[PDB]
Design an enzyme around this catalytic site. Sequence first.
Site, PDB file in Angstrom:
ATOM      1  N   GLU A 124       0.785  -1.224   0.000  1.00 41.40           N
ATOM      2  CA  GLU A 124       0.000   0.000   0.000  1.00 41.40           C
ATOM      3  C   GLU A 124       0.829   1.292   0.000  1.00 41.40           C
ATOM      4  OE1 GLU A 124      -2.957  -0.613  -0.939  1.00 41.40           O
ATOM      5  OE2 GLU A 124      -3.257  -2.686  -0.261  1.00 41.40           O
ATOM      6  N   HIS A 253     -14.528  -3.859   6.832  1.00 40.64           N
ATOM      7  CA  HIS A 253     -13.664  -2.677   6.874  1.00 40.64           C
ATOM      8  C   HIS A 253     -13.931  -1.905   8.175  1.00 40.64           C
ATOM      9  CE1 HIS A 253     -11.898   0.988   5.106  1.00 40.64           C
ATOM     10  NE2 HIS A 253     -11.162   0.106   4.425  1.00 40.64           N
ATOM     11  N   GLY A 260      -6.465  -3.942   6.080  1.00 41.45           N
ATOM     12  CA  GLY A 260      -5.757  -4.960   5.310  1.00 41.45           C
ATOM     13  C   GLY A 260      -4.663  -5.651   6.113  1.00 41.45           C
TER      14      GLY A 260
END
EC number: 2.7.7.108
Lengths: 323, 334
Positions: A124, A253, A260
């Site tokens: 990311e 989420h 993640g």
Amino acid sequence: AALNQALEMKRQGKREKAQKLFMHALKMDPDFVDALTEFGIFSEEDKDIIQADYLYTRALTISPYHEKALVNRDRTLPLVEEIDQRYFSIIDSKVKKVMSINSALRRVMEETYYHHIYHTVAIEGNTLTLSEIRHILETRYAVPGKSLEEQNEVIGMHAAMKYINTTLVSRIGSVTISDVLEIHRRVLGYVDPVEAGRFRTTQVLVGHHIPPHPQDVEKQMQEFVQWLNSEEAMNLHPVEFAALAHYKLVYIHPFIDGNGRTSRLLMNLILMQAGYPPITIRKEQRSDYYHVLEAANEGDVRPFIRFIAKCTETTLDTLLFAT
Amino acid sequence: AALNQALEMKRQGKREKAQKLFMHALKMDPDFVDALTEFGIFSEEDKDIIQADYLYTRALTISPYHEKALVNRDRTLPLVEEIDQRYFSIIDSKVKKVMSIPKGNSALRRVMEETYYHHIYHTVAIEGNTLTLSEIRHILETRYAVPGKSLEEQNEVIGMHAAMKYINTTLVSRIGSVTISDVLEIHRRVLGYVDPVEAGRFRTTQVLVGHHIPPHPQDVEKQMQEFVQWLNSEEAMNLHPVEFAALAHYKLVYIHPFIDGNGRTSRLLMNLILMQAGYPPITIRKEQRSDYYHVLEAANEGDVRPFIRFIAKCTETTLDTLLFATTEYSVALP
Ligand SMILES: Nc1ncnc2c1ncn2[C@@H]1O[C@H](COP(=O)(O)OP(=O)(O)O)[C@@H](O)[C@H]1O
Ligand SMILES: Nc1ncnc2c1ncn2[C@@H]1O[C@H](COP(=O)(O)OP(=O)(O)O)[C@@H](O)[C@H]1O
Ligand SMILES: [Mg+2]
Ligand SMILES: [Mg+2]
């Protein structure tokens, strides 16, 4: 539509040419039942029963009674269930050899540990190199010319892993909502100490996915941990359980950041609790990783389950390479 | 004891000599009533009524009926109360000067920024943080790490700024009671980037802090409820802002509610109390570490006045700087 050109193309081969037309017809309409069903019979000719099955399943979600898809799906449905069951039993053997076993195993574990952090954070946009990560953690000294947020993403990663490997792997009993927050507290605490260890208070978009409303995040998590402690879940294969837990959390989420990473850790906890080594989804697999998450949101979590299984196999292959 | 050598020595001057004997007799016995009283009398001859008073106050805690201390202590008890009241009214004038400036003024705005990073520099540097002011300005302005310095040190800085932002935005202007939750919210930011597990929660273990054993972790919570009751009491709001701030600083430090970051939260809570009373935020400089601990030790021993006075001299020096600095830029800036 463009499907008929691929069908005529399909005859006489130039299959690479027929594939492009099938792929283009799919880009113009990914919900085109006749293209899916014909592109699946195309995929089988190349021995790709798993993809053929993907396309017949996508077709029958759009058109439950499509005869051509139906007769094929009935055929491949359990052929694929076996193929998948088989891959899992292949992974189990590699796990045995590994757990059969030292100078070079211990050495691998460390090299691996720092490699997991590099990949979980790099995927990311974290620009730190494996040497910079080893530096931050070994010396406790900052790295020149790199953001403090990036270096704190690494410290929290290590803090969380330590906590899991020490406090939760060996522990007996139910996985709680409290443990998940404890992981997040460490994962995110050094970057955002206010938001770490608490759920999302706002609604967000994640690609093309709108997760549960912050009002619903808590119930969706109670349902998630109920499932983590269910017999149904413990009757799954550890690889399929881990991949599903990863996905389910990602779909909820629950946090504003670090979702993640917690999912990848929770996945590794599930795996380690079943006697599996911790898996690493490499930085280079981001595109594939998101495609399988997209197909999962679309209705089929099998490719995601398979993605995690190939990660599991690769991780073991790397361990047994030190023989 | 050695007192008689000082006393005699004191006669015939050789004061500097006298002082050493008084100081030595005090090292051998800090609870020697006759050495305290004689040394207080000695301190007055040098015009030091505040220290003379300390010594008579100290002597009477050990020997409530000591005649020599007693007669002196009545003389000085309220002289010192006036002297102290007076210093506070001197500080008030300097605050009026600072708060008499238009406040969009370009010269002040430069000083306010300079002072902000200077506060962080000193609140962290007082406990061994090796970061220079320039490194602090770097960490906060750029958000990039500093080479060759620990991450813990740089995260002490991020959390100070995070906490100061939160106070200056969420608590200064807010109306109502200061709660135990606000104190934890300050601590969450202050310590969170260094220890995210311990930040925002009280001590779970017993500790020693120099020669001071604070309340047991079982007692920390009640001692804090009593502390915030006091912060919202009219007894506390009837104090001078400087004396209220210094006492709140001390009281929290004495409780030592957290496992770390107590001194910083106390300095922040102190600055909140002050800012809520219209005072600029004060800075205990890293060079005052020794004095700061001596007044805390005397406080623990029974007299919080020197601590109150220490904070008042910090308040005055902060204002003096502000005014002088705002005046230098008034000319040299456009
Ligand atoms: N379309 C999507 N559907 C479901 N999950 C998604 C989607 N896009 C991204 N994600 C998930 O969100 C994660 C990134 O979100 P984030 O909460 O900031 O976690 P982190 O800070 O650990 O990277 C990805 O790793 C992935 O698991
Ligand atoms: N002997 C003492 N008596 C009272 N307070 C003390 C004593 N020694 C230290 N302190 C207080 O403890 C603080 C340092 O402790 P700590 O909890 O680690 O906070 P921090 O790391 O922010 O400085 C000092 O700033 C001071 O206020
Ligand atoms: Mg993220
Ligand atoms: Mg400390």
